[PDB]
């Protein structure tokens, strides 16, 4: 008996890769008589032909690592491979920071806390890279 | 890269094809001229006396 053609029909009827179809060892004779796709579907319902399950990579070990790192662990000098600017894009960081400082200054102004004159002065200083962060900006405003 | 075997792999261009007028595979589909019968070049049929021994 030679069942390779049936393997191809089976993979198509079961919608799976040929490498995943399973033919019951004790039914080679019946599967061998399977000519049409209907003959295959039939044998499938009988359970003589089945589709082996596919694999998915476990992400458990990954998740535990993701947690240590999110918590700030497992990132000492000995675990870094990329250059500093590669681990954190500096221009990207500046965009993050400067936008945060401008959103801050914009809220203080609408909230009447800053005159458009004090706001302008602080805005130009932020854009000039005067403040390391929001907290640093607030600390400055508090004289 | 050698001029021999390695350069033979790049050859997948079609040039000479079955000729409409004479039937030989000599109709250059790029020049649109048959190198065997002259189709595309002349109304007269390509012919030369050097295609045979001088006294024959």
């Amino acid at each position: 008996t030679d069942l390779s053609a049936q393997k191809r029909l089976a993979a198509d009827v079961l919608d799976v890769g040929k490498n995943r179809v399973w033919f019951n060892p004790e039914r080679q004779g019946d599967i061998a008589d399977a000519i049409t796709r209907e003959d295959v579907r039939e044998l499938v319902d009988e359970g003589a032909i089945q589709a082996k399950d596919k694999k998915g990579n476990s992400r458990g070990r990954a998740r535990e690592r993701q947690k240590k790192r999110a918590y700030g662990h497992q990132k000492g000098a000995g675990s870094r491979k990329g250059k500093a600017g590669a681990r954190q894009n500096s221009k990207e960081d500046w965009e993050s920071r400067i936008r945060a400082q401008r959103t801050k200054l914009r809220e203080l102004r609408d909230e009447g806390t800053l005159s458009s004159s004090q706001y302008r002065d602080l805005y130009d200083k932020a854009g000039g890279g005067e403040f390391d962060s929001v907290a640093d900006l607030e600390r400055y405003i508090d004289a | 890269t050698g001029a021999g075997t390695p350069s033979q792999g790049k050859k997948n261009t079609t040039t000479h094809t079955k000729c409409r007028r004479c039937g030989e595979k000599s109709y250059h589909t790029k020049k649109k001229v048959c190198s065997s019968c002259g189709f595309g070049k002349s109304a007269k049929r390509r012919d030369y006396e050097w295609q045979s021994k001088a006294g024959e």
Binding site: - | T14, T17, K18, K25
Partner: protein
Amino acid sequence: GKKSKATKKRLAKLDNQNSRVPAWVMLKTDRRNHKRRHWRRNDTDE
């Protein structure tokens, strides 16, 4: 490639010619398609 209608007619003819000499021709002549071609070993025209 892309074949034209004519090319296709010529290819088809080549396929047809590429067949056995009928058995009866053997008997009648009391004992070879000298033009048997193989797609791989040979090369057709065009």
